[PDB]
């Protein structure tokens, strides 16, 4: 469908993953109206992350924020691949960070990243599969969204993002109905405890899993987790998604798992990524007390 | 008016800001009577900060402490620019620190400075505006006073101290009456929570704001804070105050915000500053219990 | 006796210490079936420690785990010296770690080692007695088992493992019946407090002692601890056990103490060790509440 | 008087300070019987500190411990200068540490020293007065004793230990009867709070004072502390005590303050000191409950 300032279309991998593209006109207006604040301004003054979010959404006739929220909160969807026409080269890395910042802070707030010391982190790669997982499993607070952007890509064969929506996982009911699915387990990167599975508000399964940080306490937990790992990694429901330079995935971390495919080692390989993770925060008609 | 040991006169920028000058006679007597304790003695033995405060006030026929307290506690004023005749060169930096220490510890105590590891900090600059703010917003305890002294100044164009008394801010009522004015927000440099506005004992607005450390949790808090920032930074009530070498500002941190103007980058630029921050502590007739 | 996949035989030092040897056939099958996961995979993904435990026990017709548990939990025994035919050279260090990992995680879980940052630690030596002690005395949680493996041994004269089963200690009753045996004392490597002696479920003495970390608070505690030390170190019940390359001791840390004999300083001496410590965890028929 | 293994005699500075000298026969027997444990053994295994204490006291026909306790606990005395005939050269530093360790652990236990990471600390000096103070004022637990030993002394003019018994301080009653004497104040090297004065079991004044770590909160506390400082530093009751190599002071930290006199800067100056601090612990007939 045609919205104000962007277009929206289902991906070739899955109707659950929608591709959102900001038009050139919208992109150049946004970059002009946020040229005043460099990325370092966003790092130091967090309210500016919300200011550039507003500018972007205002440029979309206030259609962007409700569309982002409806898509990410919809159990049937929950995943976007987002880009802006004309932003597609590593030389525009700062513009990429500004744009991703604006989109994220229309739907929530991005958390501190211990690896960068900022609300986002940039990584350079210069090659086996990264297994599917949820982020944020080793802290008490829930991470609702994962944002992963391709900043640069050179002589890169393979390395697609891997995605699995829990409602596409043919082994969901077998593992979810197991008693250990509800057992709180230790997670360590202070340790926290929570089960591998939980439920959303409607009783449907969500996951809080990563194989590196879950710490099975005994043989019973361990053997079950290793079968869970196999059952996830071999699932026929996994999506394999190219993420070209200037595109980013924005996914609901509760019922999507993500990872990364193997890629070819090449001497001149360069891949740059940018990540953000945070929680949802948005207005809705709902109950409160007092005045 | 003519006091004992010093003179007091309103500034050219504002009747709220008073200029206090210690006479040459008072200055040389003070420096003589405190020559026994170098600044390093004040760093190691905090009661000596109060000893040099007493010496200074005794040299003013005990008129200084009550004048300092009455001015800083007066909502109509709350700000002093203080100097001593004959102390005006970077070579007298230690004397400057002694004098500022004596003045501060007549009205309170200066807190530990994480940047220096001492009760004061000296910074050298060798250029855009520093936005108006209150100090101490990222800890639980209230900072009542900010003390900022010019130790050295070379080839410096611009860079005045910026000051804003809340009762000169034409947008006070619009932001203070907003519901978010009373919302406790997260501040981070352990995180603390408090609103951007509060009230003094008489119900009049005070502020605990800085754009770098306030952490809006969502789009609602963020957009409001960015408009607050604009409304402060563009206020026609801001004072632009030169602070010559050997002068220091001493302001009530609750209803004055402070910052620093842009200055010209110059290859041979040198500016040295000294800061102290602390809480008020003083005698008054008021109620207690027991014996 | 002849079990499935291994043999079991009493040691020459003591009927309490049993020697368990995996057959060549079992050893090569295990190494083949776990070749897919290098040691670094076990370091990062703890459930894999339980996966390789299962593979080993499945290769023993599920006779290994119950035998390990029955031996280690038996007060009359509680100690194993374990090896696999064909794994006996430092070049197979990784295979050694895999095998020891599999055995340990059939009976419990190995704890984080602050010296290595992993669930195990490797040390190289390149010479006086290490006194008998229990591990884990400076934390609140009980360490049930100590696993010590010889990875390499070159020009090594002496240095046997020293072992003492409390039921072989001729001074047990004299020290256990002393009031200070039940006095909680301070242990420090946050400090913890516990007595030097405790009891198992049947009222029989267990120990939580090491001379370096126990911190007697006064002359009374100190003199008694020094006599305890002498009484342990001179006990005629101590076993002196060679541990050849590829063998490991696996002992119940509650009623066995361990240490190390003096060895000859030699310029070309090389000794490599690997340790794991953890808690028991296993299935048994016992009571629970609720459903 | 003549005791078994040592002699005891009042000092030339004060009848409150007694000089205890171990005879040559006692000294050589002690060093022989503790030759088995080097100082590094005492650092690692704290009960050995009590073992060498016992050996020393046994060599004194068990007269040493009761004499040490009676002297240090006696309000009229509370201070010893201790030496052993034949131990008087820096080359015997380890022997000095052994001897001081044995004496201290007959009457208590020496605490961890953050400056050395051991139960004692050695410092080399290679020159103004160190003001009188009590140790341990910045932690919650009471330090009952300070032990200070001269390990080496070369081209040293001046630098006597300074001592003040509170019952020799002509200003005791004036400061003790002041309300601020009972005011808990902040001490910082987590901060602790306690008054400058307290009382012993009989209501007599004790002190917990040092000018560097006490943190007066305001002008009232500060001015009073500075007068207290003057009143202590100018007291005519201060003792000036040479401490030759191999001698150590052992004082009751509650009613003795200590410091150090000025000394002459000399290019070839070398002074080595060893300190221990701890709490009293000893047997006495007194009440308990239960069995
Ligand atoms: O993001 C997190 O907080 C946990 C997952 C880290 C990873 O991506 O491996
Ligand atoms: O002073 C503080 O404690 C907060 C403000 C720091 C600044 O001046 O930017
Ligand atoms: O293992 C531990 O946790 C304590 C003992 C350390 C040692 O082997 O000396
Ligand atoms: O010993 C302490 O714990 C406090 C005093 C330190 C000093 O001797 O200056
Ligand atoms: Fe991730
Ligand atoms: Fe400031
Ligand atoms: Fe051990
Ligand atoms: Fe001291």
- The helix (H) or strand (E) run that includes residue D214 is strand D214-215
Q: Do C109 and A218 touch (CB under 8 A)?
A: yes
Strand B145-154 to strand B248-252: parallel, antiparallel, or no bridges (unpaired)? antiparallel
Compute the radius of gyration of chain A from its Cα atoms: 19
* Dihedral pair phi/psi, residue B196, rounded to 5°: -70, -40
Q: Do D47 and C229 touch (CB under 8 A)?
A: yes
If DSSP codes are grouped into helix, strand and coil, which group holds residue B32?
Answer: helix
Q: Do D212 and B44 touch (CB under 8 A)?
A: yes
Q: How many CB atoms lie within 10 A of CB B264?
A: 11
DSSP B120: S
Both structure tokens of D110 = 């020496």
* Dihedral pair phi/psi, residue B58, rounded to 5°: -60, -40
Report yes or no: C229 and D48 within 8 Å, Cβ to Cβ. no
Q: Which residues contact D157 (CB under 8 A, 6 or more apart)?
A: D263, D264, D266
- C153 in contact with ligand 3, CB cutoff 6 A: no
C-alpha angle A93/A94/A95, rounded to 5°? 90
Both structure tokens of D47 = 């009960």
- A278 in contact with ligand 1, CB cutoff 6 A: no
Report yes or no: C199 and C206 within 8 Å, Cβ to Cβ. yes
Q: Do A219 and C51 touch (CB under 8 A)?
A: no
Q: How many CB atoms lie within 10 A of CB B65?
A: 21
**Nearest residue to B50 via CA among B119, B112, B120, B101:** B101
* Burial of D268 per CB tally in 10 Å (0-12, 13-18, 19+): exposed
Q: Whose CA is nearest to atom 3 of ligand 4?
A: D136
Q: State how far the Cα of D145 lies from the Cα of D255, in Å rounded to an integer.
A: 10
Which chains form contacts with chain C, at 3 or more CB pairs under 8 Å?
Answer: A, D
Q: Which residues contact C83 (CB under 8 A, 6 or more apart)?
A: C19, C20, C21, C22, C244, C246, C247, C248
Q: Do B226 and A47 touch (CB under 8 A)?
A: yes
Nearest CA in chain C to D50: C222
Both structure tokens of C216 = 């007697």
Q: State how far the Cα of D101 lies from the Cα of D95, in Å rounded to an integer.
A: 10
What string of DSSP letters covers C95-154?
HHHHHHHHHHHHHEEEPPBTTTTBSSEEEEE--PPEEEE-S-TTSSS---EEEEEEEEEE
Which chains form contacts with chain A, at 3 or more CB pairs under 8 Å?
Answer: B, C
Q: Do B212 and A45 touch (CB under 8 A)?
A: yes
Q: State how far the Cα of C49 lies from the Cα of C40, in Å rounded to an integer.
A: 11
Report yes or no: B276 and B69 within 8 Å, Cβ to Cβ. no
Closest CB from A211, A212, A216 relative to C50: A216
Report yes or no: C205 and C277 within 8 Å, Cβ to Cβ. no
What string of DSSP letters covers A90-139?
GGGHHHHHHHHHHHHHHHEEEPPBTTTTBSSEEEEE--PPEEEE-S-TTS
C-to-N gaps above 2.5 Å in chain A, after residues? 126, 189
The reported resolution of this PDB entry, expressed in Å, is 2.4
Q: Is A135 annotated as a binding residue?
A: yes
Q: State how far the Cα of A284 lies from the Cα of A20, in Å rounded to an integer.
A: 23
**Nearest residue to B229 via CA among B196, B194, B198:** B196
**Integer CA distances (angstroms), D207 to D117, D136, D253, D255, in order:** 27, 11, 8, 6
- A135 in contact with ligand 1, CB cutoff 6 A: yes
| Domain chopping of chain A, boundaries | 1-291
Q: Do A217 and C281 touch (CB under 8 A)?
A: yes
User: Ligand 1 centroid to A15 CA: how many Å?
Assistant: 26
Q: Which segments of chain D are extended strands (E)?
A: 6-10, 17-22, 79-84, 108-110, 121-125, 130-133, 145-154, 161-165, 185-187, 192-194, 197-199, 205-207, 214-215, 239-241, 248-252, 256-260, 270-280
- Helix and strand counts by DSSP (H, E) for chain C: 7, 17
Q: Measured in whole angstroms, how far is the alpha carbon of residue D175 from the centre of its chain?
A: 24
Q: Which segments of C5-103 are extended strands (E)?
A: 6-10, 17-22, 79-84
Q: Measured in whole angstroms, how far is the alpha carbon of residue C70 from the centre of its chain?
A: 16
> Testing the interface with A: which of C33, C50, C62, C108 to mutate, by most A Cβ within 10 A?
C50
C-to-N gaps above 2.5 Å in chain C, after residues? 126, 189
Both structure tokens of B99 = 């004098």
**Nearest residue to C145 via CA among C192, C79, C62:** C79
DSSP A271: E
Pocket test residue of B130, B133, B135, B251 for ligand 2, highest count of atoms within 8 A of CB? B135
Q: State how far the Cα of B199 lies from the Cα of B201, in Å rounded to an integer.
A: 7
Q: Which residues contact A79 (CB under 8 A, 6 or more apart)?
A: A14, A16, A17, A18, A71, A72, A163, A165, A249, A250, A251, A252, A256
- Which protein residues touch ligand 2 with a CB less than 6 Å away? B 135-136, 210, 277
Report yes or no: C20 and C80 within 8 Å, Cβ to Cβ. yes
Sole residue written with tokens 């006692």: D26
Q: Give C211's contacts in chain D (Cβ within 8 Å).
A: 45, 47
Closest CB from D44, D48, D108 relative to C226: D48
Q: Which residues of C are annotated as a binding site?
A: 133, 135, 258
Q: State how far the Cα of A106 lies from the Cα of A147, in Å rounded to an integer.
A: 13
**Domain D1-291, what fold?**
Double-stranded beta-helix (3.60.130)
If DSSP codes are grouped into helix, strand and coil, which group holds residue A275?
Answer: strand
Nearest CA in chain B to A52: B223
| Dihedral class, residue A225 (left if φ above 0, else alpha if ψ from -120 to 50, else beta) | alpha
User: Ligand 3 centroid to A230 CA: how many Å?
Assistant: 37
* Dihedral pair phi/psi, residue C274, rounded to 5°: -135, 130
Sole residue written with tokens 């986002």: A120
Both structure tokens of D91 = 């080359």
Q: What atom of ligand 4 comes closest to residue D133's alpha carbon?
A: 5
> How many Å is the maximal CA-CA distance in chain A?
64
| Dihedral class, residue C77 (left if φ above 0, else alpha if ψ from -120 to 50, else beta) | alpha
Q: Whose CA is nearest to atom 3 of ligand 3?
A: C136
Report yes or no: D277 and D104 within 8 Å, Cβ to Cβ. no
Q: How many CB atoms lie within 10 A of CB B92?
A: 18
Both structure tokens of B38 = 């170098």
Closest CB from A45, A48, A281 relative to B219: A281
Q: Is A258 annotated as a binding residue?
A: yes
Please report how many Cα atoms fall inside a 13 Å half-sphere around the Cα of residue D80, on the Cβ side: 23
DSSP D129: P
Report yes or no: D278 and D104 within 8 Å, Cβ to Cβ. yes
**Nearest residue to A185 via CA among C109, C149, B201:** C109
**Nearest residue to B263 via CA among B240, B246, B280, B283:** B240
Q: What atom of ligand 2 comes closest to residue B139's alpha carbon?
A: 3
If DSSP codes are grouped into helix, strand and coil, which group holds residue D24?
Answer: helix
Report yes or no: A106 and A53 within 8 Å, Cβ to Cβ. yes
Report yes or no: A149 and A271 within 8 Å, Cβ to Cβ. no
Report yes or no: D98 and D39 within 8 Å, Cβ to Cβ. yes
Both structure tokens of B252 = 């009530």
Closest CB from A53, A109, A283 relative to B217: A109
CB proximity C283 to A under 8 Å: yes
Q: How many CB atoms lie within 10 A of CB D147?
A: 24
Both structure tokens of B175 = 């932001």
**Integer CA distances (angstroms), B122 to B44, B54, B139, B154, in order:** 17, 24, 21, 16
User: Ligand 1 centroid to A136 CA: how many Å?
Assistant: 6
């Amino acid at each position: 469908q045609d919205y104000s300032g962007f277009t929206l279309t289902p991906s070739a991998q899955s109707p659950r993953l929608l591709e959102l593209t900001f038009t050139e006109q919208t992109t150049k207006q946004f970059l002009e109206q946020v040229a005043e604040w460099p990325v370092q301004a966003l790092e130091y003054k967090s309210f500016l992350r919300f200011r550039v979010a507003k500018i972007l959404d205002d440029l979309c006739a206030n259609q962007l924020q409700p569309l982002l929220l409806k898509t990410l909160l919809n159990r049937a969807e929950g995943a976007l691949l987002i880009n802006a026409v004309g932003v597609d080269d590593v030389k525009q890395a700062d513009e990429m960070v500004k744009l991703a910042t604006a989109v994220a802070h229309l739907i929530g707030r991005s958390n501190f990243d211990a690896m960068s010391g900022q609300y986002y982190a940039r990584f350079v790669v210069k090659h086996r599969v990264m297994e599917l997982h949820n982020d944020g499993t080793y802290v008490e607070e829930i991470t609702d969204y994962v944002l992963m952007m391709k900043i640069d890509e050179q002589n890169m064969q393979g390395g697609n993002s891997l995605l699995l929506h829990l409602d596409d996982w043919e082994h969901l009911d077998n593992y979810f109905r197991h008693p250990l699915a509800r057992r709180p387990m230790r997670f360590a990167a202070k340790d926290v405890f929570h089960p591998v599975f939980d439920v959303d508000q409607q009783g449907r399964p969500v996951m809080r899993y990563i194989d590196q940080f879950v710490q099975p306490k005994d043989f019973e937990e361990g053997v079950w987790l290793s079968e869970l790992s196999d059952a996830i990694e071999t699932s026929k429901g996994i999506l394999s998604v190219p993420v070209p330079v200037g595109k980013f995935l924005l996914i609901n971390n509760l019922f999507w798992l993500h990872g990364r495919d193997r890629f070819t080692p090449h001497p001149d390989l360069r891949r740059e990524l940018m990540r953000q993770r945070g929680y949802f925060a948005y207005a809705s008609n709902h109950y409160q007390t007092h005045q």
